[PDB]
Amino acid sequence: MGRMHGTLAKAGKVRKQTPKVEKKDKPRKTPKGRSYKRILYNRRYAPHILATDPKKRKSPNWHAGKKEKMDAAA
Amino acid sequence: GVGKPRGIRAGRKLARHRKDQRWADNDFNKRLLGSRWRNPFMGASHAKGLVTEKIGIESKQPNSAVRKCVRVLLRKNSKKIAAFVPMDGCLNFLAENDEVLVAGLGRQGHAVGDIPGVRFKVVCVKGISLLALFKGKKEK
Amino acid sequence: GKTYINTSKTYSTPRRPYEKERLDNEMKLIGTFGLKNKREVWRVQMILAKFRKAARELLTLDPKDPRRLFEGSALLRRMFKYGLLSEQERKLDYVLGLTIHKLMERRLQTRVFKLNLANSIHHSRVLIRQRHIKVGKNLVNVPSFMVRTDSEKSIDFASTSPLGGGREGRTKRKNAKKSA
Amino acid sequence: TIVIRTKKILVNPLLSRRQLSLDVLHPDSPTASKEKIREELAKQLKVDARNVVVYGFSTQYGGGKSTGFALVYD
RNA sequence: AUGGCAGUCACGGGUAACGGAGAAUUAGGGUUCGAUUCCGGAGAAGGAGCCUGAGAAACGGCUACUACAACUACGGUUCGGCAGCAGGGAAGAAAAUUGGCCAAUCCUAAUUCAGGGAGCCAGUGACAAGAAAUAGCAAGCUGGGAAACUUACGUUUCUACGGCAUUGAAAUGAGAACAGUGUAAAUCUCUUAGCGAGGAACAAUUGGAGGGCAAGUCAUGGUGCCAGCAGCCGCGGUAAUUCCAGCUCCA
Ligand SMILES: [Mg+2]
Ligand SMILES: [Mg+2]
Ligand SMILES: [Mg+2]
Ligand SMILES: [Mg+2]
Ligand SMILES: [Mg+2]
Ligand SMILES: [Mg+2]
Numbered sequence A: 001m002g003r004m005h006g007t008l009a010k011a012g013k014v015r016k017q018t019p020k021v022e023k024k025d026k027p028r029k030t031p032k033g034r035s036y037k038r039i040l041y042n043r044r045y046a047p048h049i050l051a052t053d054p055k056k057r058k059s060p061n062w063h064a065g066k067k068e069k070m071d072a073a074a
Numbered sequence B: 001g002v003g004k005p006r007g008i009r010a011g012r013k014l015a016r017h018r019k020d021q022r023w024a025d026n027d028f029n030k031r032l033l034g035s036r037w038r039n040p041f042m043g044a045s046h047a048k049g050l051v052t053e054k055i056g057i058e059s060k061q062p063n064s065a066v067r068k069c070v071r072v073l074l075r076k077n078s079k080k081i082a083a084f085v086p087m088d089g090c091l092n093f094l095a096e097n098d099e100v101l102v103a104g105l106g107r108q109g110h111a112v113g114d115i116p117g118v119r120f121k122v123v124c125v126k127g128i129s130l131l132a133l134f135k136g137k138k139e140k
Numbered sequence C: 001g002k003t004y005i006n007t008s009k010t011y012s013t014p015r016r017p018y019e020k021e022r023l024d025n026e027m028k029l030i031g032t033f034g035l036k037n038k039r040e041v042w043r044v045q046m047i048l049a050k051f052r053k054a055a056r057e058l059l060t061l062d063p064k065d066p067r068r069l070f071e072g073s074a075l076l077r078r079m080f081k082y083g084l085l086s087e088q089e090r091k092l093d094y095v096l097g098l099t100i101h102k103l104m105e106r107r108l109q110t111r112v113f114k115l116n117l118a119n120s121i122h123h124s125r126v127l128i129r130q131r132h133i134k135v136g137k138n139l140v141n142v143p144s145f146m147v148r149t150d151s152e153k154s155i156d157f158a159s160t161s162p163l164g165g166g167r168e169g170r171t172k173r174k175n176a177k178k179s180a
Numbered sequence D: 001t002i003v004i005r006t007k008k009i010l011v012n013p014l015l016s017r018r019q020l021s022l023d024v025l026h027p028d029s030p031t032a033s034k035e036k037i038r039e040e041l042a043k044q045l046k047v048d049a050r051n052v053v054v055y056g057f058s059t060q061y062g063g064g065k066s067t068g069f070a071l072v073y074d
Numbered sequence E: 001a002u003g004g005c006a007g008u009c010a011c012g013g014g015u016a017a018c019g020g021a022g023a024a025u026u027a028g029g030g031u032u033c034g035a036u037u038c039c040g041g042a043g044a045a046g047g048a049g050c051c052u053g054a055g056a057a058a059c060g061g062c063u064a065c066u067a068c069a070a071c072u073a074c075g076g077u078u079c080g081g082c083a084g085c086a087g088g089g090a091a092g093a094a095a096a097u098u099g100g101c102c103a104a105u106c107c108u109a110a111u112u113c114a115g116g117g118a119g120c121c122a123g124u125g126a127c128a129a130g131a132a133a134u135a136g137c138a139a140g141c142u143g144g145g146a147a148a149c150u151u152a153c154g155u156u157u158c159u160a161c162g163g164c165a166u167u168g169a170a171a172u173g174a175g176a177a178c179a180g181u182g183u184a185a186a187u188c189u190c191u192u193a194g195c196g197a198g199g200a201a202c203a204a205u206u207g208g209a210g211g212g213c214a215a216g217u218c219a220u221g222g223u224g225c226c227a228g229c230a231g232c233c234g235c236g237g238u239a240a241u242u243c244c245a246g247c248u249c250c251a
């Protein structure tokens, strides 16, 4: 256990260390209000989803990344 | 049997018996004798104080870390209080001898998690929020 | 300030903040009746609940009882005018059977859409918020308007707006008034 | 054009006037200025303009109507 | 004369206690509040004492003391008493304008016409309540489904419905205005001309994705028991589903 650089117990350590990563600029925007719950209904409780096997229904966040949105659309 | 009277003239003995046994219920006890009012907050929701000390507190087993804290002198009480300072490097937003706003930790008089015995948290510094400061909405 | 106007609470919050079955049902409701915002379904729930407490208290009572007679009569008469109840069920027991599905179906959105006056359960909700529809002698700008069976006759567009023969709005005007 | 339905009419000898509830129908137009409502009312009831006081007008939501009150002194 | 009260709780403490009408919850039974719109009671810095009246122990009356407030040429004086309204100071975790009127409501008076910080009007106001925008409809390209067939990929429609830093014109309020409504006047609303929508704008947040508890099966980056998270169980000691962040997703 011979790797040590910073003093133990320094206050801001982990937050200061963390690189600043910028929030991605979104093409267009996220609809506010009713329209959003429309969007949700569509991608979640809509007829086609219901028609599929309820035990095989796919969980809402399964994809973090876009490669599986490409695998989902195919 | 049942060790309890059932009879129509038995009313007062019943009600008195409860008026007695009720005392064993803790929240009732603590309520009924002023207990709230004597605590460092004097019954209150939050309190303002001055910072005596910045202090590190080594966490309870089985955790190791240094919990950032402060000892505050409550302006209403002049009682001394040991309070925790939340999130990350927020101990830096504090200077010795500032005005500070302090609340319970959510156990109403008791300590939470690995911080032993410390019952309070820091909310405001000078006038501003620790949240406001952390996310960097405002500046001190 | 002394003031004697009365207090209201239109809705209620569930004992259990997260339960799938319930959340899913609520989103099926929000979906089909084109709502936004869960509390809308909650306030509908509240309303239904009131109706049911009424029917229940009345079923406590003797069938001969003057109060059950009068107030029961009043409750059912109150149903027809809203068309929550079909012609055949005038018995207090059928009140209890009321579905939120029936009661939301009495919405002004639900009405405008299903009247072929709007393409979509959503198209509707803008329209009646756009000031584009008249109900009876008034102009109803409110989606939550519970529809009089009797006013279902006169639901047509506002004489004010286009679709009512009124002047074409600022959009068409600004497009058309720029020549070539 | 302005139509005026005259509604609730109380003959009040005590103050020697007639008290009136008014209904103005202006289906294509903004709320009617009192000058016009006065003049149309006087036209109806045959009295002088400055013998009629017109007050408290409420246009409804959507703008076909107004309800108001009038007084006509002897 | 020797009574009167007391275990059927006297007497005496405590109350971060004014009593009700009522309020929050409520299967039922309960629990917990009621300083605060109405009705009682009490008080006007603390005590006491008065005048005058039909009514007063008044307090926007006087007298005295205790503790204070304002002038003073020091000898004197005050129509000195915010628990009236507005506003200060202080205390605190904690609470608005030194505004406009008697138009309404009522009260008072020798009185139709005078007065009223009662009251009303406006300001401050995420105490709290009600309704409710933040986009709608199609199109071109795609997914998806459902059919037929073709035996194995082509066709065709779409009573599912989706998705596009892609096109199209309509619809309308937020904004802002002539006028009209409203007012004691002023503001606001309401009705309405002339105006006011294509994208980091007219762009919603606040909290969360291990369990309780809805939501990650990121081969994501940082940190390596540190910084920190965690109501509770616990997460972190170099592959963190729990910290710091990015994406996404949930409430
Ligand atoms: Mg307990
Ligand atoms: Mg809690
Ligand atoms: Mg432990
Ligand atoms: Mg944020
Ligand atoms: Mg006000
Ligand atoms: Mg009490």
Ligand SMILES: [Mg+2]
Pocket: none
């Ligand atoms: Mg009495």
Ligand SMILES: [Mg+2]
Pocket: E082
């Ligand atoms: Mg005051």
Ligand SMILES: [Mg+2]
Pocket: E102
């Ligand atoms: Mg006067």
Ligand SMILES: [Mg+2]
Pocket: none
């Ligand atoms: Mg609100």
Ligand SMILES: [Mg+2]
Pocket: none
């Ligand atoms: Mg104006």
Ligand SMILES: [Mg+2]
Pocket: E197, E198
């Ligand atoms: Mg736009």
Ligand SMILES: [Mg+2]
Pocket: none
């Ligand atoms: Mg995370």
Ligand SMILES: [Mg+2]
Pocket: none
């Ligand atoms: Mg977090």
Ligand SMILES: [Mg+2]
Pocket: none
């Ligand atoms: Mg990692």
